[PDB]
């Protein structure tokens, strides 16, 4: 039969099918079938055409995306999309009436809009343009200007600056509508004293002089952005006087120094929760704020404060978890770490300090998915004690001993990794299985957990793949000091454990990472195992997540140590297994994986022949403050400068004489700056080490443009094949 080739991977010849739906009510959802927008009925499965695909091929532009108002009356049309960072972009927008079937032409959302969002009910619009917030009560009426302080690279209203987009909210948007759309809450970010990273962008051949890109970007220990939080009443807006925003100040425990706004969650129509986080991120507070028309302010009662801090590391996995409020808003459920260091659901009263865990065990809750008056729905890795598994559970609120697994036994062979999408009021839910078999999408009704139908079973792909010698995947664990540590291996087809195979260690290994799971993937490793008979292993050592704080917080204040050592040790045990050629063990990684790869290669352990680092961190003082300081604290003599200096890649330059190294970086990387690899090469040059290198002009951290993506994997494949003496 055939094998899964590099061309198959680069040309996407074996496609995974998806089933992306948008719930619009408690029983209906939108879905795109052959470019039409269809509205489906959850209970019956019938569908009408919501929007005929021919509706806008007379529009004059290409639609990048669309957004339908909650009441169904209007569709927001996105075109002229221009990507900025990981989540940010600008676009032109047209609104289109769905009963009159006509394009609104008056009082239009301007070109180069930074963000747009419908109110959660009805059809109000809030958008951000030139760093200021505007509100349209009706699609054809004029806009009310909420903010006037907006200013490029300095003041951000309703949108995030670079570091808040990347490391805090994972979003460009900093707008939070109240549940019924009365209030619009928004953050204001201030980058006034934040230093700028600068780098060249070469652009098209026709550009004579390169551009210099300048982004406000706080590297470790540098001056951070500041933040203020506001709420505006969108129902009492005046076309004659300037809008009034009420400021919700951070609690005084935060104002004494540097801090972040790290969570925003509306509790009720007149109650908002905010979570703040000190710049030393082992201390956070939640504030609960009620609207008070009488006194014209948002009162945040001190007695309603909830302090969350950590004694072994930082708070949350990457940030304090979001609360899920009961309907009346007087109590809420929140994932927090227990006394054993495991993360479970805790039950809070808004005015009571102590909380009550409703789950426990040596496993973890991944996320709270839905809340009804009777049941709390969550995802966890409890099943068979596999940290790399995900299942849907519901727990009865009247009796915490009644826990039901809703996904475990549906198809235990094919499906061990689940996510879920609930309808409104959680009357229906879609289940999405990602492995270890081909992905499978089903729909269920909540009232009696009945399976209604299969939405997508990837049977097309299944038929295609049987003519192909596909690799298999082994998920298991080894033991280090009476502790289970999980690994996975992508094994070549017809795997003969009496043969010796070369091994490529696929590493990431950042804090709370997980590279050993049950997820089905069709990627580069698939080609390496299927065509080149390479074993591709990954290993979750110390610092990895979803296994309790004792593992995760192990690398606290000491990045570049245990997580690095544990990758070397795992490779040693792999080479002892008998089917691994120990003269041909390589290692490769991206971003944090690039750092670990490099640190491993420079350790002089002798275990690895060659390695590839793509866009690596090389020195933690080079990386942004929020991510870095979360794990390392501040780079000062009073804090943690010693570990900052001892954990660079440049420090280990001498040891690279023992290995073949390939260093790759995009020149337009706004995330892990080219500087980082630039310093690695300089240190290797200064010490006489030969190595391979590759820059990618105007590529960012993803190196994901069509041509660049194909080029780097083609290049890396040559490198691996040559290193492994494959012809």
């Amino acid at each position: 039969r055939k094998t899964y080739t590099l061309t198959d991977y680069l040309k996407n010849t074996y496609r995974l099918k998806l089933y992306s739906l948008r719930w619009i009510s408690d029983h209906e959802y939108l879905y795109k079938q052959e470019n039409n927008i269809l509205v489906f009925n959850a209970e019956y499965g019938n569908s009408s055409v919501f929007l005929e695909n021919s509706t806008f091929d007379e529009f004059g532009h290409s639609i990048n995306d669309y957004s339908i108002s909650p009441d169904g009356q209007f569709i927001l049309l996105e075109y002229n999309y221009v990507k900025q960072w990981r989540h940010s972009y600008t676009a032109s927008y047209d609104i289109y009436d769905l009963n009159k079937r006509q394009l609104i032409t008056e009082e239009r959302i301007p070109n180069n809009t930074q963000w747009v969002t419908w109110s959660p009910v009805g059809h109000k619009l809030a958008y951000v343009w030139n760093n200021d917030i505007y509100v349209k009560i009706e699609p054809n009426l004029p806009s009310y200007r909420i903010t006037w302080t907006g200013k490029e690279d300095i003041i951000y209203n309703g949108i995030t600056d670079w570091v808040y987009e990347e490391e805090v909210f994972s979003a460009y948007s900093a707008l939070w509508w109240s549940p019924n759309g009365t209030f619009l809450a928004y953050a204001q970010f201030n980058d006034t004293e934040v230093p700028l990273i600068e780098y060249s962008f070469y652009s098209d051949e026709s550009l004579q002089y390169p551009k210099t890109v300048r982004v406000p970007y706080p590297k470790a220990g540098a001056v951070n952005p500041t933040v203020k939080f506001f709420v505006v009443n969108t129902d009492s807006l005046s076309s004659v006087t300037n809008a009034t925003s009420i400021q919700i100040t951070a609690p005084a425990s935060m104002l004494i120094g540097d801090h972040y706004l790290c969570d925003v969650t509306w509790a009720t129509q007149e109650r908002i929760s905010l979570q703040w986080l000190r710049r030393i991120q082992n201390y956070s507070v939640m504030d609960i704020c009620d609207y008070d028309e009488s006194s014209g302010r948002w009162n945040c009662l001190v007695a309603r404060q909830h302090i969350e801090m950590s004694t072994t590391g930082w708070v949350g996995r990457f940030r304090p978890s979001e609360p899920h409020f009961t309907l009346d808003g007087n109590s809420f459920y929140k994932i927090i770490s227990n006394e054993e260091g495991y993360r479970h659901i805790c039950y809070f009263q808004i005015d009571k300090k102590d909380c009550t865990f409703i789950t426990k065990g040596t496993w973890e809750v991944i996320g709270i998915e839905a809340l009804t008056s009777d049941y709390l729905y969550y995802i966890s890795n409890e099943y068979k004690g596999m940290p790399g598994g995900r299942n849907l559970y519901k727990i009865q609120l009247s009796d915490y001993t009644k826990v039901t697994c809703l996904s475990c036994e549906l198809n235990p062979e094919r499906c061990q990794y689940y996510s879920v999408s609930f309808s409104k009021e959680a009357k229906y839910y879609q289940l999405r299985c990602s492995g270890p078999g081909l992905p499978l999408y089903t729909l269920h009704s909540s009232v009696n957990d009945k399976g209604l139908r299969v939405l997508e079973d990837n049977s097309a792909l299944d038929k295609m793949l049987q003519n192909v010698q596909m690799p298999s995947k082994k998920l298991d664990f080894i033991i280090l000091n009476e502790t289970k540590f999980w690994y996975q291996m992508i094994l070549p087809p017809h795997f003969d454990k009496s043969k010796k195979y070369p091994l490529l260690l696929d590493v990431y290994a950042g804090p709370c990472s997980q590279k050993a799971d049950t997820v089905f993937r069709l990627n580069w490793a698939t080609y390496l195992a299927s065509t080149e008979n390479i074993i591709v292993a990954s290993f979750d050592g110390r610092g990895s997540g979803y296994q309790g704080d004792k593992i995760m917080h192990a690398i606290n204040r000491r990045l570049g140590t245990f997580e690095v050592e544990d990758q070397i040790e795992a490779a040693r045990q792999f080479s002892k297994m008998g089917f691994v050629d120990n003269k041909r063990i390589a290692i490769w990684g991206w971003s944090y994986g690039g750092y670990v790869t490099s640190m491993v290669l420079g350790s002089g352990s002798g275990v690895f022949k060659c390695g590839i680092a793509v866009a690596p961190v090389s020195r933690w003082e080079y990386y942004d403050s929020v991510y870095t300081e979360r794990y390392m604290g501040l780079p000062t003599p009073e804090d943690n400068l010693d570990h900052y200096r001892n954990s660079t890649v440049m420090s280990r330059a001498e040891n690279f004489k023992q290995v073949e190294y390939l260093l790759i970086h995009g020149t337009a990387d706004d995330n892990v700056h080219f500087q980082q690899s630039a310093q690695i090469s300089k240190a290797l040059v200064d010490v006489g080490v030969d190595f391979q290198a590759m820059w990618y002009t105007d590529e960012d951290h993803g190196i994901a443009s069509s041509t660049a993506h194909q080029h780097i994997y083609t290049h890396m494949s040559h490198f691996i094949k040559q290193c492994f003496s494959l012809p």
Binding site: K228, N242, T244, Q247, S253, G296, Q305
Partner: protein, 208 residues
Amino acid sequence: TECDFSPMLTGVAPQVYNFKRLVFSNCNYNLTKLLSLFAVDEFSCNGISPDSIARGCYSTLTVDYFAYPLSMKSYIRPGSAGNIPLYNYKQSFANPTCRVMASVLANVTITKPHAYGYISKCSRLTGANQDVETPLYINPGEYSICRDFSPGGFSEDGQVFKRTLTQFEGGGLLIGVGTRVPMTDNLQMSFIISVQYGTGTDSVCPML
């Protein structure tokens, strides 16, 4: 001799939390005259009528005055509290009072402040993790402990202030926030008039 309501219209109008007070004794006043310089929006009295206030004989006539936007009219009213009566100015009702909400007229010649400003946070901080927060509130007629931070106003909306409290003041940290309300076309003010009826020989009657 005549009552001198001059100082409350010369110089720069003080902010609400930094109110200035004129106390008159043995002095004859024209209230109608003083009120003529303003466009009055609210005239709420307590323990006395807006007619009697301009015609009565008093032992003392006290006026607290400050800049204040009329958009915040409702937030300085009794019992409805309130960033203003908590941290800035709390009206006393121990004596007959009158609260006047007014805009100064166009060709009066006042030099107004850059903006209106009030304190919207004032707390003491103690504890090992610096997190026992105790909001500090004023008694009527007294100045906030957070007033000294920036008596002239706030150049920034949501401006933060920090200070160590002396052993005497109770120790710990003092935290204050001030908010900024943009200045209006015509200066908007507020003055609180208070009278007493003392037995002593000396009065403040109106002018004949």
